[PDB]
Amino acid sequence: VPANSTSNILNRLLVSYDPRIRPNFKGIPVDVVVNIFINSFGSIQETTMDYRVNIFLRQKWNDPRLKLPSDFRGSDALTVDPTMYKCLWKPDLFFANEKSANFHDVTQENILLFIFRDGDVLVSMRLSITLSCPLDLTLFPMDTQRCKMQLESFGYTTDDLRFIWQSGDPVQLEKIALPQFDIKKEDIEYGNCTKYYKGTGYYTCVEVIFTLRRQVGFYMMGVYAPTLLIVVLSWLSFWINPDASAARVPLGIFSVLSLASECTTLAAELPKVSYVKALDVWLIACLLFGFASLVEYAVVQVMLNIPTAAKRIDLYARALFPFCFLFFNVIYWSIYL
Amino acid sequence: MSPSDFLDKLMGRTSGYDARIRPNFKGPPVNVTCNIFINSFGSIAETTMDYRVNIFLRQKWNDPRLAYSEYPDDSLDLDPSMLDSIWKPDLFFANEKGANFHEVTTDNKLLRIFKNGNVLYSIRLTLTLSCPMDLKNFPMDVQTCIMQLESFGYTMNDLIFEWQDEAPVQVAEGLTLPQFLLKEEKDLRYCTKHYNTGKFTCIEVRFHLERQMGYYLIQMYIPSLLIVILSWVSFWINMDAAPARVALGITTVLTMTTQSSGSRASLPKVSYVKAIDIWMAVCLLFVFSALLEYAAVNFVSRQKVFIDRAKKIDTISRACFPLAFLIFNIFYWVIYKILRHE
Amino acid sequence: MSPSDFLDKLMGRTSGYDARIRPNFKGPPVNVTCNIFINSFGSIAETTMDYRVNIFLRQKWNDPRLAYSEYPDDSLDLDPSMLDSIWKPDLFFANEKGANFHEVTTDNKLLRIFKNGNVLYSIRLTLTLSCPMDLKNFPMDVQTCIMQLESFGYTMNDLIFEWQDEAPVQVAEGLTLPQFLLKEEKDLRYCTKHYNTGKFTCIEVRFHLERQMGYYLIQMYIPSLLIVILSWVSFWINMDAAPARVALGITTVLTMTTQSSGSRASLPKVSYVKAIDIWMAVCLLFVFSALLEYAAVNFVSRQRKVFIDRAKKIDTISRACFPLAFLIFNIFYWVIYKILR
Amino acid sequence: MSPSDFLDKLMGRTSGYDARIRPNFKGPPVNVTCNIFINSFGSIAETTMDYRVNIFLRQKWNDPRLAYSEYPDDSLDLDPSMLDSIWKPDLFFANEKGANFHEVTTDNKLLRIFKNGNVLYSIRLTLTLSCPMDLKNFPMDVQTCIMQLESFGYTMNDLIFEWQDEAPVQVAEGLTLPQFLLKEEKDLRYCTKHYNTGKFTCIEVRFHLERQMGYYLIQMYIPSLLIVILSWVSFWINMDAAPARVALGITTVLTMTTQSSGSRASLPKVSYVKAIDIWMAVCLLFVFSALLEYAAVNFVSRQKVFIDRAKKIDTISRACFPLAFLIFNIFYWVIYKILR
Amino acid sequence: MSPSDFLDKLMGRTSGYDARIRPNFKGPPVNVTCNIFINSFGSIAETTMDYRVNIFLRQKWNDPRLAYSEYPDDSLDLDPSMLDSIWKPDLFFANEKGANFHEVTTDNKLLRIFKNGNVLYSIRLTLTLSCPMDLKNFPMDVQTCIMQLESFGYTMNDLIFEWQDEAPVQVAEGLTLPQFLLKEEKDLRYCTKHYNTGKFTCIEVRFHLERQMGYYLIQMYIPSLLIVILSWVSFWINMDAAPARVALGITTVLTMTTQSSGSRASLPKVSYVKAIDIWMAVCLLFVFSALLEYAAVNFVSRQRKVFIDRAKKIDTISRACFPLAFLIFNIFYWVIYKILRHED
Ligand SMILES: *[C@@H]1O[C@H](CO)[C@@H](O)[C@H](O)[C@H]1NC(C)=O
Ligand SMILES: *[C@@H]1O[C@H](CO)[C@@H](O)[C@H](O)[C@H]1NC(C)=O
Ligand SMILES: *[C@@H]1O[C@H](CO)[C@@H](O)[C@H](O)[C@H]1NC(C)=O
Ligand SMILES: *[C@@H]1O[C@H](CO)[C@@H](O)[C@H](O)[C@H]1NC(C)=O
Ligand SMILES: *[C@@H]1O[C@H](CO)[C@@H](O)[C@H](O)[C@H]1NC(C)=O
DSSP A151-176: EE--SS-TTTEEEEE-SS--EEE-S-
Whether residues A233 and E253 touch (CB distance < 8 A) is answered with: yes
Residues A24 and A159 in one domain: yes
> CA–CA separation, A22 vs A88, rounded Å?
10
Amino acid at D245: R
* Topology classification of domain E3-212: Acetylcholine Binding Protein; Chain: A, (2.70.170)
Q: Phi and psi of A78, rounded to 5°?
A: -110, 115
Inter-axis angle of helices B242-265 and C242-265, to 10 degrees?
20
Inter-axis angle of helices D242-265 and E242-263, to 10 degrees?
10
Residue having the nearest C-alpha atom to atom 4 of ligand 5: E31
Residues A31 and A163 in one domain: yes
> CA–CA separation, C242 vs B189, rounded Å?
69
A 10 A CB-CB count for C265 gives 11
Alpha helices in chain A (DSSP H): 3-10, 217-219, 225-239, 245-268, 278-304, 307-336
What's the Cα-to-Cα distance from D71 to each of A109, B61, C26, D331, rounded to whole Å? 47, 54, 10, 73
Amino acid at B123: I
CATH number of the structural domain C214-340: 1.20.58.390
A 10 A CB-CB count for C194 gives 12
> CA–CA separation, C248 vs B246, rounded Å?
9
What's the Cα-to-Cα distance from E276 to each of A215, A279, E288, E337, rounded to whole Å? 20, 24, 18, 12
Nearest to B175 by CA among B132, B133, B209, B127: B209
Residues across chain B: 342
Residue B6: strand, helix, or coil: helix
- Cβ–Cβ < 8 Å for E47, E135: no
Binding site annotation covers B200?
yes
Amino acid at A258: S
Torsion of CA D242, D248, D252, D258, to 10 degrees: 100
Give me the DSSP letters along C97-159.
S-EE--BSSSB-EEEEE-SSSEEEEEEEEEE--B-----TT-TT-EEEEEEEEE-SSS-TTTE
Pairing assessment for the beta strands C159-162 and C30-45 based on DSSP bridges: parallel
Q: D247 and chain B: CB distance < 8 Å anywhere?
A: yes
The structural architecture, per CATH, of the domain E215-340 is: Up-down Bundle (1.20)
DSSP state of B218: I
Residue C30 CA, ligand 3 centroid: distance in Å: 6
Query: Nearest ligand, CA of residue C27?
Result: 3
> CA–CA separation, B4 vs E236, rounded Å?
96
How deeply is E14 buried, as exposed, middle or buried, from its count of CB atoms within 10 A (0-12, 13-18, 19+)? Answer: exposed
> Sign of the CA dihedral C10, C123, B152, B172?
positive
Our answer on whether the CB atom of D28 is closer than 6 Å to any ligand 4 atom is yes
Ligand 3 atom closest to the CA of C31, numbered from 1: 1
How deeply is B289 buried, as exposed, middle or buried, from its count of CB atoms within 10 A (0-12, 13-18, 19+)? Answer: middle
Could you tell me which chains touch chain C, where touching means 3 or more CB pairs under 8 A? B, D
> CA–CA separation, C125 vs C101, rounded Å?
5
Pocket-testing residue among A194, A202, A203, ligand 1, by greatest number of atoms within 8 A of Cβ: A194
A 10 A CB-CB count for C176 gives 10
Residues A48 and A195 in one domain: yes
The distance of D46 to chain C (nearest Cα, Å) reads 13
Inter-axis angle of helices D242-265 and B242-265, to 10 degrees?
20
Residues across chain D: 340
H helix or E strand, kind and range, residue D144: strand D142-150
> CA–CA separation, B313 vs B317, rounded Å?
6
Residues across chain E: 344
Q: Please, which residues 4-23 of chain E have a Cβ atom closer than 8 Å to chain D?
A: 4, 7
What's the Cα-to-Cα distance from D72 to each of C20, D76, D224, rounded to whole Å? 20, 9, 73
Residue D107 β-bridge partners: D103
Residues A207 and A250 in one domain: no
Q: Phi and psi of D215, rounded to 5°?
A: -65, -50
- Cβ–Cβ < 8 Å for D207, D52: no
Query: CB under 8 Å, gap of 24 or more: what pairs does E17-21 form?
Result: E17/E65, E17/E66, E17/E86, E18/A4, E19/E84, E19/E85, E19/E86, E19/E87, E20/A4, E20/A7, E20/A81, E20/A83, E20/A84, E20/E87, E21/A2, E21/A3, E21/A4, E21/A7, E21/E87
> CA–CA separation, A245 vs D160, rounded Å?
85
Q: Which residues of B230-262 are buried (b: 16+ CB within 10 A; e: fewer)?
A: bbbbbbbbbbebbbbbbbbbbbbbbbbbbbbbe
> CA–CA separation, A249 vs A255, rounded Å?
10
Q: What's the domain count of chain A?
A: 2
Pocket-testing residue among B160, B165, B201, ligand 2, by greatest number of atoms within 8 A of Cβ: B160
Residue E312: strand, helix, or coil: helix
CA A329 distance to own-chain centroid: 29
What's the Cα-to-Cα distance from A212 to each of A129, A222, A270, rounded to whole Å? 18, 21, 18
Residue having the nearest C-alpha atom to atom 2 of ligand 5: E31
CA E173 distance to own-chain centroid: 20
Which residues of chain B are within 8 Å of residue C219 when distances are taken between CB atoms?
264
The approach used to solve this structure was cryo-EM
Residue D75 CA, ligand 3 centroid: distance in Å: 21
Nearest to D265 by CA among E262, B246, C326, E48: E262
Q: Do domains B3-212 and B215-339 have the same CATH topology?
A: no
A 10 A CB-CB count for D10 gives 22
> CA–CA separation, A217 vs A179, rounded Å?
12
- Cβ–Cβ < 8 Å for A266, E261: no
Residue D54: strand, helix, or coil: strand
Which residues of chain D are within 8 Å of residue B243 when distances are taken between CB atoms?
243-244
Residue A192 CA, ligand 1 centroid: distance in Å: 6
> CA–CA separation, C41 vs C178, rounded Å?
10
Instruction: Please state the domain extents for chain C.
Output: 3-210, 214-340
Whether residues A233 and E291 touch (CB distance < 8 A) is answered with: yes
> CA–CA separation, A287 vs A284, rounded Å?
5
Query: Nearest ligand, CA of residue E159?
Result: 5
The distance of A195 to chain E (nearest Cα, Å) reads 30
How deeply is C315 buried, as exposed, middle or buried, from its count of CB atoms within 10 A (0-12, 13-18, 19+)? Answer: buried
A 10 A CB-CB count for B334 gives 11
Q: D254 and chain B: CB distance < 8 Å anywhere?
A: no
Mutate to test the interface with A, among E26, E271, E284, E293 (most CBs of A within 10 A): E271
The distance of B152 to chain C (nearest Cα, Å) reads 6
Whether residues C82 and B20 touch (CB distance < 8 A) is answered with: yes
CATH number of the structural domain B215-339: 1.20.58.390
R_g of chain C, CA atoms, integer Å: 32
Our answer on whether the CB atom of E118 is closer than 6 Å to any ligand 5 atom is no
- The domain C3-210 is placed in CATH, from the list 2.70.170.10, 3.90.1150.10, 1.10.540.10, 2.60.120.200, at 2.70.170.10
C89, C130, C277 member nearest D40 (Cβ)? C130
Torsion of CA E300, E302, E307, E313, to 10 degrees: 50
Range of the domain at A68: 3-215
Q: Residue E88: which residues within 8 A CB-CB, separation 6 or more? A: A107, A108, E121
CA E203 distance to own-chain centroid: 19
Name the resolution in angstroms: 3.7
What's the Cα-to-Cα distance from C198 to each of A263, D171, D212, rounded to whole Å? 65, 16, 35
- Cβ–Cβ < 8 Å for D168, D231: no
Give me the DSSP letters along B189-200.
E----EETTEE-
> CA–CA separation, A295 vs A286, rounded Å?
14
DSSP state of E174: T
Nearest to B259 by CA among B228, B223, B296, B226: B223
Ligand 3 atom closest to the CA of C62, numbered from 1: 13
A 10 A CB-CB count for E196 gives 13
CA A61 distance to own-chain centroid: 30
Pocket-testing residue among D25, D26, D30, D31, ligand 4, by greatest number of atoms within 8 A of Cβ: D31
